[PDB]
Amino acid sequence: KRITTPYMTKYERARVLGTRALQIAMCAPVMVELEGETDPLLIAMKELKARKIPIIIRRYLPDGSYEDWGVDELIIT
Amino acid sequence: RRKYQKKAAACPDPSLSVWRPDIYFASVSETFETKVDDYSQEWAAQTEK
Amino acid sequence: AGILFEDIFDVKDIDPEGKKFDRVSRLHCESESFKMDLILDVNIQIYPVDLGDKFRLVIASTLYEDGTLDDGEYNPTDDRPSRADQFEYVMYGKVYRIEGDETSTEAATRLSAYVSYGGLLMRLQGDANNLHGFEVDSRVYLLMKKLAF
User: By the 8 A CB rule, do C122 and C114 touch?
Assistant: First the structure.
């Protein structure tokens, strides 16, 4: 039972692509085929269009509770 | 005492107090519902010819 | 044939609305066979028209009178027998507005089709029996030649 926005917001996409781009750097393994760029932000943003980023988000409701949404299932704009 | 149903017990609540707008589709404000419906009435008139 | 319109007009007035653009002039024309009317913007620098003159007017949707496919691309390296070589002044523009004088009546007596030849505008109002081919966003050509008698 999870009732929040099904849409990924902008800040969600910023932190997911930031950490995922740092989850590419320091020899970290990549899960899509690449045309050969060296900027990790392009790599992490191509996995967002791939829906291959496995990250689960703990959206803190103000009680202290949270829902576990998945970037695989969140609808980008 | 059917007057308790003739006089409704209240008006219904706004559509974005009950049935919140982030999940529940087509729950907009009353002002925006009035604007959408006036433009539907005008759009049918201009799209008639 | 890909002809959508054909009539012989007659210039009766030039720039009555006062907006005198340089190298472009309005031409309030009237037909003679029919009772239609015409507003036309021609290029005076290239093809000059004065009042009282009479000209053939053809509005086609393709230059290829045989093998009608109206591909919609200009190639100057192609020489093919087309429809443009008979006339002197050839334009190319969309139809953007069709607004007649209707009163809850489809295809009324007056129907006005507005053509915009990359900026040079054109009104062609008349009986709606002639203007069947014109739809909105329809790439039509304008073909024109002046004849003096």
Answer: yes
Tokens representing B2 are 């059917």
For residue C30, what are the domain limits? 5-149
Query: Closest Cα of chain B to C14: distance in Å?
Result: 32
Domain range summary for chain A, segments of one domain joined by +: 1-77
CB C44 within 8 A of CB C122: no
Q: Does A61 touch chain B (CB under 8 A)?
A: no
Residues of A in contact with B22 (CB under 8 A): 4-5
Question: If you measure CA to CA, which chain C residue comes closest to B48?
Answer: C104
**Cα gap C4→B29, rounded to integer Å:** 50
Which chains lie within 8 Å of chain A at 3 or more CB pairs, if any?
B
Contacting partners of chain B (3+ CB pairs under 8 A): A, C
Residue A5's contacts (CB-CB under 8 Å, 6 or more residues apart) are B22, B23
The crossing angle, in degrees rounded to 10, of helices A10-22 and A40-50 is 120
